[PDB]
Amino acid sequence: YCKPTRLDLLLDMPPVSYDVQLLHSWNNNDRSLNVFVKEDDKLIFHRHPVAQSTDAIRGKVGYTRGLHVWQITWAMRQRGTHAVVGVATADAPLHSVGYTTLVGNNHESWGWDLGRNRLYHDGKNQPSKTYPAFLEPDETFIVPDSFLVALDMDDGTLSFIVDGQYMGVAFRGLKGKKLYPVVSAVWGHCEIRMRYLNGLDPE
């Protein structure tokens, strides 16, 4: 549960400008059509209040190498029954009927369910895993409104940092892919912000 040195270095760097944030923000050309990027606030998408629907959207950049960190802000009261945060390849589906853990439900996505404290990957075929891993079985862990996602494409891992605490590696095995930030949501009018902070090339 100790931050890697490379991550400590990145987290120390001043964060990138809004102009650069916009290069990595939510892609309005790579979404469920039941969400949209807000015109006046392009770091944020809005989900239309569609019943029995789960909807996702990918960030503009798919990372293949280096360490990358971004910030998610997702207000507790706008999470509903299935608030999932992670990464996906370009082939991951961005919608399902019903309310589900869309991100992590297939071989193309890896998600942390913020309400369940559970990780999903190929979730129709594999069991979910408790995260953070230190939680005893019935134990509650409240994810705050904002937290960080760390994708290390060189090591091939996804981890999370919550209120400055490294929560451990969530997923492994990601080397050689091209992975995009993604969230799946079920709450009507939820607005979810993603802010890219920095990246560090390999070496």
């Binding site: 059509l33 569609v50 309310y99 709450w187 009507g188």
Partner: peptide, 18 residues
């Protein structure tokens, strides 16, 4: 409903996938 959604608004993504 339980997720602040309703049946009145169109499921555009579902109709796009039809």
């Amino acid at each position: 409903d339980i997720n602040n959604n309703n049946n009145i608004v169109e499921d555009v993504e579902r109709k796009r996938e039809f």
